[PDB]
Scaffold this active site. Structure first.
Site, PDB file in Angstrom:
ATOM      1  N   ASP A 168     -82.944  77.274 -10.156  1.00  0.00           N
ATOM      2  CA  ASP A 168     -82.898  76.454 -11.536  1.00  0.00           C
ATOM      3  C   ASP A 168     -82.459  77.698 -12.655  1.00  0.00           C
ATOM      4  O   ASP A 168     -83.362  78.730 -12.694  1.00  0.00           O
ATOM      5  CB  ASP A 168     -84.206  75.835 -11.649  1.00  0.00           C
ATOM      6  CG  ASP A 168     -84.332  75.025 -13.117  1.00  0.00           C
ATOM      7  OD1 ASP A 168     -83.388  74.238 -13.256  1.00  0.00           O
ATOM      8  OD2 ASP A 168     -85.018  75.126 -14.031  1.00  0.00           O
ATOM      9  N   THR A 219     -80.086  73.011 -17.169  1.00  0.00           N
ATOM     10  CA  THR A 219     -80.004  74.173 -17.820  1.00  0.00           C
ATOM     11  C   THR A 219     -78.751  75.252 -17.373  1.00  0.00           C
ATOM     12  O   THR A 219     -78.019  75.878 -17.876  1.00  0.00           O
ATOM     13  CB  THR A 219     -81.252  75.025 -17.872  1.00  0.00           C
ATOM     14  OG1 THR A 219     -81.424  75.118 -16.599  1.00  0.00           O
ATOM     15  CG2 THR A 219     -82.325  74.314 -18.619  1.00  0.00           C
ATOM     16  N   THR A 220     -78.566  74.890 -16.149  1.00  0.00           N
ATOM     17  CA  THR A 220     -77.396  75.767 -15.458  1.00  0.00           C
ATOM     18  C   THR A 220     -76.104  75.309 -15.988  1.00  0.00           C
ATOM     19  O   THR A 220     -75.108  76.024 -16.091  1.00  0.00           O
ATOM     20  CB  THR A 220     -77.499  75.403 -13.817  1.00  0.00           C
ATOM     21  OG1 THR A 220     -78.766  75.804 -13.428  1.00  0.00           O
ATOM     22  CG2 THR A 220     -76.361  76.370 -13.165  1.00  0.00           C
ATOM     23  N   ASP A 274     -89.374  69.693 -11.134  1.00  0.00           N
ATOM     24  CA  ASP A 274     -88.073  69.480 -11.565  1.00  0.00           C
ATOM     25  C   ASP A 274     -87.647  67.884 -11.028  1.00  0.00           C
ATOM     26  O   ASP A 274     -86.823  67.657 -11.576  1.00  0.00           O
ATOM     27  CB  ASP A 274     -87.122  70.424 -10.929  1.00  0.00           C
ATOM     28  CG  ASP A 274     -87.264  72.077 -11.675  1.00  0.00           C
ATOM     29  OD1 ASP A 274     -87.429  71.806 -12.773  1.00  0.00           O
ATOM     30  OD2 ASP A 274     -86.956  73.080 -11.025  1.00  0.00           O
TER      31      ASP A 274
END
Ligand SMILES: Nc1ncnc2c1ncn2[C@@H]1O[C@H](COP(=O)(O)OP(=O)(O)O)[C@@H](O)[C@H]1O
Ligand SMILES: Nc1ncnc2c1ncn2[C@@H]1O[C@H](COP(=O)(O)OP(=O)(O)O)[C@@H](O)[C@H]1O
Ligand SMILES: Nc1ncnc2c1ncn2[C@@H]1O[C@H](COP(=O)(O)OP(=O)(O)O)[C@@H](O)[C@H]1O
Lengths: 483, 510, 509
Positions: free
Chosen positions: B43, B76-77, B377
């Protein structure tokens, strides 16, 4: 920044690549405590060789898991994993991805777990005999201390047979080894219960007590008052009824008189590790003050007496009324460095049969089952379509590095050994391993010699070794952070 | 202009970093703490919020994932990869002499056209057990070794359904996380109740009680100080122990009413009682309650006592003088499982505890903490699927269908604004290009394949990570939340606006 | 891949150099020879053929424009601009991981699609005076300083129209280009006849002759060798003079032979005679022929004698003993023009010369060479306009319409080659981006208006240099040749195919 991680794990294997097998080389271990050690045990190398490269630490934590639930196959974790990543670089040179290679190993690990039971030729007979344990423990003596195949095969068997009747209660924590300065291995012996080399300070012979408690005019007045103070302490012990007092520190000349006055056996043990063994067996802990008369911190033992074995006064702590599952192997040796190397081979033998308390299954070693395992995985890799062929085919060649280590460490050419190991298995001559001989590069059947590994050990050794090669290959770049 | 090229080349390097760890075919990254801890994760928010970056400009991008994690917790990646490609494409237009402000308005117009297109792709289907299984498999795959996919999929989904019913707003505080060693990684399971850290220390305690009543208390039954206006009136050391019994007399009498409360409240056989006192208990007090078969616990955490009120129902009592049976809870099979290192109490088999505990099992700490990242997550993705019933197909199906719309979009705001729309369209297409490299297939073959698919109805195709063919993400079971893609169009454009608006760089004391 | 990055950035720098001399509103480049010669020009062929570049990779691009100028005669500046932008956009995909082989396949498909697009938008307008003026305006406007446009436009148009009849193909050797100094630059006009460098110099000559029969000769009228079996043998300076009396009998007797032909063929008044002998002439032969109304010219060029045969019609003679009336010509007004210092012969108003003269006038040497190339570059632009009956609109109007056809085009051969078409689309749009900067306006704002122009009809939209709005190139008189754009897209794809396929650069000596 991927190959730098492969070159890191590649170097860690080459150190223990030579310490593998019975003809493996020794290691000049310099302890951090200003001590020198010389041995060939691969587990002790990593404890001292501080490999700070975190890419290789994943292989070390896998080797640490090879200590839990099993006590063998440490070289398998470092050799098989190190050979997997060496050939993995050959794949990425062509242009392959990292995920397809990981998925190919995840499939090959499932194919290897299914071929290993097929190669289980023989196993233990489950008779709890001394000839059964000594005949099968020859595998644990290998590559830990060569030459003592006859002595330690029977010595280790004597301590385990006393606990095998206690079905489901055999543990390595029940067998505590001791070592005394002596001439050599011939003076070694095996005794029941807890046996300590230190003699009895008092003149008491035998006592069946359960309470074991582990721990100018004015100038002459206080000097004699100290004699009354020490007497008051042994009187406090006599008030509690503890006839066996284990002293951790030093003993006064007057305490030896009061210990015999009230008929109290007084034993001195300067080693702290020997005192810790009493905490987990009889329940008596080491108290810091001068003999606290605490009846709660005293242990429980059916019998305590003094014995003399091998010309050495040793105190016996056995259990007659209770079942009893504690055994002590007392070894003798002139050199403390080599004497401790034998102590590790004993722990390797106790843990080998601790796993055989489960379903007893054994597999021949010496390059017999590893090529038979690589011969069948290569068959699945040839017919299995898709891009997973390159990873499964090389996963079989990773198994070849182990007999290549047994060949080079034995001074035998590595290529000639595998060529003959594959010819005998092409004809179906299973269980045919490499013969340990510096002059004869031939092979023979290892089952006839009495070399049999643990089926339950190779499972966790192949699983933790392959999962480590996945964990190290998933990390393609190491990046530092500052908390 | 050269000052703007630094922030462009600064985020370009951050694009090349976080492009290989996207998806299950992607790679992992290590966190060298320097103190002795090593962490592995994929992540991007974990790779930036705890990490310190060399360049100063890229450090500002690290705070984007910090604010982004508070909204959605995922994606976010892909946010940095869209930002890296936007400013990469915009550099080709600024190099010809265009101003950055004209390109930003082009993205501001592409935001509405892209956001308005999001209303069409999302599906308002009813969220059920079979639908969330497709959701958990899409998230947890990028955090495990392709073996714990089916293991953790059934745990995260059942954890959510067991704590939300009747359109009740759900909260993440209801799910507790626990870790245990000396086990394999595939043994992850769920717990009906709450697992307690500290248990009882006495051989006379019942190992497992099929049914026992709970009593919440905060009174320390150890040797406590004086409560009334008195003191230690003595003349020797032996008299000191006599008044110690007086300070214990107020304590010893309070434990005798507990046995009376047990005898009055189901004091017949085939019964039990379990005390959950947070404060310590004396070995003598445990010796008195252990004779009656009362499994008393001590040295618990303040967080468990609050959860114990919800699971057991017993109200917290502050003094045994006001001991009443009204504050008594209840539990089902109350036992203490024996593990290789320590013992832990279980209060499972509750009717409706309003709190579950996902018991994670792993041998190593870096593996145990990695799964802890997969839980939080994976849980939030399902939290976003139920709280927002709208979900969209993954596999870049949203980005490709949006990118096809922006090319066939006329300028509805300004004339030169169309150039930013041309750049924003080439940025969203990086997602199928990124996953093409992690899968090992050709980066260009994956793009035109999913783009050549056209028909006279709804057709949203995606990337086949295993084969590379244009595959439908909606049918194979790949679904993403509506709020996740919604934040990408707002975060990537607002942040990319702030980078292109920098004209010069001045050192304020550096 | 690194072998391409050295070649990619080599063209990008070459793109920024030659982009500031595209169109009339762009700048010029200076050529420092080091010996003393300085030159100014915008034509990319001269900036690459005569100029020396530091990089060897860029030196290969110079030979492309050299051959491009030999076929079409114009458009070599934008040929390198598209090449520099083709590799610029190819590098955007090479960074992602695309091999150059697939990108060349995309250019091959777009090159054939765009070549088909020219067949649709080309206009086969009838060739006449008014239309060719619109074409010659496009070729000469970028080679002058915004004043010689209307001056030189009428020259090149009427020059080609004078030498085109009976469906005869065009030939550039039918135009004699001469230069004159000591005059202004705007005095460049057309000369119907042929201009000779050297002419008659004697006071007894006529200033102008309304009609004269031109006799073509190649006979030497200066001191030559002995024509009989003899030689030059003397003993002193006085004896040497006696040999002059003998040798001059071969020269002096040939002067009277021309006089006998003068009285024979039209020896009366209201007539004339002009000798155009290529060899030198003695003053005694000039004085002898000047009194007889016979204008004697000497010191002519080898090619001028070839055109002189066509002007008057008299056949070239080699000896006056072989003189006959059959080799006599005829012309109209034959006079002598006077400059500030020198004087030249003019034989205008010929019968059927089939050869015109474009007389250039300029005060300076370096400025006369600038117009020297603009004449050859202006004559060839209209040459392809008549030989190729179809023309296309200028103003970069083909590029913006071509971008609409290729974006609305899918390859029927494979998918991954579609991106090569996307690169070829943005590579062609660099021309409206370049001209927008040379005009001083915004680069992108000019591209939006020309691209946003759409309608439910055939709409040709181009670039306005004076205001920056969409300009219909057909309404303003802005046109190019059909072979120019056809050779542009046919050439630029082959070079991009040859360079992008270079995998490695080895130092071969
Ligand atoms: N004399 C021998 N004959 C055949 N195989 C041997 C011999 N000695 C060692 N080996 C092989 O070496 C391997 C490693 O043995 P051991 O040292 O007990 O484990 P580790 O290398 O993990 O410490 C065994 O699997 C065994 O097959
Ligand atoms: N095999 C796959 N098929 C379809 N989509 C995928 C696949 N792998 C990853 N994705 C997409 O990548 C996106 C991001 O995944 P992940 O990296 O786990 O979250 P984040 O990027 O927020 O950290 C998801 O929305 C998902 O749709
Ligand atoms: N004033 C102008 N405005 C717009 N376009 C022009 C103008 N002048 C020339 N062009 C375009 O520029 C191109 C190149 O013209 P020219 O200068 O004759 O060739 P080169 O640039 O190769 O010397 C032509 O195709 C023409 O359409």
């Amino acid at each position: 920044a991927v190959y730098r991680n492969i070159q890191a794990c590649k170097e860690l294997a080459q150190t223990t690549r030579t310490a593998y097998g019975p003809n493996g080389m020794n290691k000049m271990v310099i302890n951090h405590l200003e001590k020198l050690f010389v041995t060939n045990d691969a587990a002790t190398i990593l404890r001292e060789l501080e490999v700070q490269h975190p890419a290789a630490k994943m292989i070390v934590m896998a080797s640490h898991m090879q200590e839990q639930e099993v006590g063998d196959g440490t070289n398998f974790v470092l050799v098989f994993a190190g050979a997997l990543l060496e050939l993995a670089e050959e794949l990425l040179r062509i242009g392959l991805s990292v995920s397809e290679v990981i998925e190919g190993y995840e499939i090959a690990c499932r194919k290897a777990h299914e071929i290993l039971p097929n190669l289980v030729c023989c196993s233990a007979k489950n008779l709890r005999d001394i000839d059964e344990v000594s005949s099968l423990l020859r595998t644990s003596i290998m590559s830990k201390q060569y030459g003592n195949e006859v002595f330690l095969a029977k010595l280790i068997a004597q301590a385990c047979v006393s606990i095998f009747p206690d079905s489901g209660h055999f543990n390595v924590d029940n067998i505590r080894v001791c070592k005394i300065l002596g001439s050599g291995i011939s003076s070694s012996s095996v005794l029941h219960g807890m046996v300590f080399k230190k003699e009895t300070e008092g003149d008491v012979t035998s006592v069946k007590d359960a309470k074991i408690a582990v721990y100018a005019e004015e100038l002459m007045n206080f000097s004699k008052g100290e004699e009354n103070l020490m007497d008051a302490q042994v009187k406090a012990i006599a008030d509690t009824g503890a006839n066996v007092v284990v002293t951790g520190g030093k003993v006064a000349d007057m305490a030896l008189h009061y210990a015999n006055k009230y008929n109290i056996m007084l034993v001195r043990l300067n080693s702290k590790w020997d005192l810790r063994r009493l905490c987990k067996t009889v329940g008596a802990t080491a108290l810091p003050r001068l003999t606290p008369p605490v009846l709660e911190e005293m242990g429980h033992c059916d019998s305590v007496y003094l014995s003399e074995v091998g010309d050495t006064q040793v105190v016996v702590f056995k259990h007659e009324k209770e079942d009893g599952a504690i055994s002590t192997i007392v070894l003798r040796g002139s050199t403390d460095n080599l004497m401790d190397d034998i102590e590790r081979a004993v722990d390797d033998g106790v843990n080998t049969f601790k796993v055989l308390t489960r379903d007893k299954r054994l597999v021949p070693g010496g390059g017999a089952t590893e090529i038979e395992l690589a011969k069948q995985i290569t068959s699945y890799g040839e017919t299995c379509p898709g891009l997973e062929q390159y990873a499964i085919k090389k996963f079989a060649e990773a198994f070849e590095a182990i007999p290549r280590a047994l060949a080079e460490n034995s001074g035998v050419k590595a290529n000639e050994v595998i060529s003959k190991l594959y010819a005998v298995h092409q004809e179906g001559n299973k269980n045919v391993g490499l013969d340990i001989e510096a002059e004869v590069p031939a092979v023979k059947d290892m089952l006839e010699a009495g070399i049999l590994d643990t089926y339950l050990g190779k499972y966790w050794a192949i699983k933790l070794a392959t999962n480590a090669a996945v964990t190290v290959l998933r990390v393609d770049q190491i990046i530092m952070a500052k908390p | 202009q050269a000052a703007l090229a630094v922030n462009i080349s600064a985020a370009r390097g951050l694009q090349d970093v976080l492009r290989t760890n996207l998806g299950p075919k992607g790679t992992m990254k290590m966190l060298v703490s320097g103190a002795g801890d090593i962490k592995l994760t994929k992540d991007g928010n974990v790779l930036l919020h705890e990490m310190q970056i060399q360049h100063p400009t890229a450090s500002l991008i690290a705070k984007v994932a910090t604010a982004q994690d508070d909204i959605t917790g995922d994606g976010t990646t892909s946010n940095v990869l869209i930002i890296g490609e936007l400013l990469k494409q915009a550099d080709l237009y600024i190099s010809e002499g265009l101003h950055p402000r004209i390109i930003t308005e082009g993205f501001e117009a592409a935001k509405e056209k892209a956001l308005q297109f999001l209303e069409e792709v999302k599906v308002s289907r009813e969220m059920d057990r079979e639908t969330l299984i497709d959701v958990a498999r899409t998230s947890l795959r990028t955090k495990v070794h392709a073996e714990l996919a089916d293991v953790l999929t059934e745990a995260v989904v059942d954890s959510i359904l067991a704590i939300k019913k009747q359109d009740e707003p759900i909260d993440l505080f209801m799910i507790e996380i626990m870790e245990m060693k000396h086990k394999s990684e595939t043994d992850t399971s769920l717990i009906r109740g709450l697992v307690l850290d500290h248990g009882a220390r006495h051989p006379d305690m019942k190992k497992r009680v099929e049914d026992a009543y709970i009593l919440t208390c905060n009174v320390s039954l150890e040797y406590e100080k004086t409560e009334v206006n008195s003191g230690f009136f003595y003349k020797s050391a032996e008299e000191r122990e006599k008044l110690v019994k007086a300070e214990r007399k107020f304590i010893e009498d309070r434990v005798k009413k507990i046995i009376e409360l047990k005898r009055k409240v189901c004091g017949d056989s085939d019964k039990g009682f379990v005390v959950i006192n947070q404060k310590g208990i004396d070995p003598f007090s445990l010796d008195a309650l252990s004779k009656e078969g009362i499994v008393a616990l001590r040295r618990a955490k303040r967080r468990n006592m609050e959860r114990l009120t919800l699971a057991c129902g017993g109200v917290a009592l502050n003094s045994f003088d006001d001991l009443s049976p009204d504050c008594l809870g209840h539990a089902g099979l109350v036992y203490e499982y024996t593990l290789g290192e320590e013992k832990f109490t279980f209060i499972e088999k509750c009717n409706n505890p309003r709190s579950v505990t996902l018991l994670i099992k792993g041998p190593n700490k870096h593996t145990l903490t990695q799964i802890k990242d997969a839980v939080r997550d994976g849980l939030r993705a399902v939290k976003n699927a139920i709280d927002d019933g709208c979900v969209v197909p993954g596999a870049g199906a949203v980005e490709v269908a949006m990118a096809e719309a922006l090319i066939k979009h006329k300028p509805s705001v300004k004339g030169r604004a169309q150039l930013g729309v041309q750049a924003f369209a080439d940025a969203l297409l990086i997602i199928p290009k990124v996953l093409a490299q992690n899968s090992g297939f050709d980066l260009q073959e994956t793009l035109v394949k999913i783009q050549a698919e056209h028909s006279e109805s709804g057709q949203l195709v995606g990337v086949d990570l295993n084969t590379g063919e244009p595959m439908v993400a909606a049918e194979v079971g790949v679904w993403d939340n509506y709020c996740v893609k919604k934040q990408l169009l707002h975060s990537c454009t607002v942040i990319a606006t702030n980078i292109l608006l920098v004209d010069e760089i001045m050192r304020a004391g550096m």
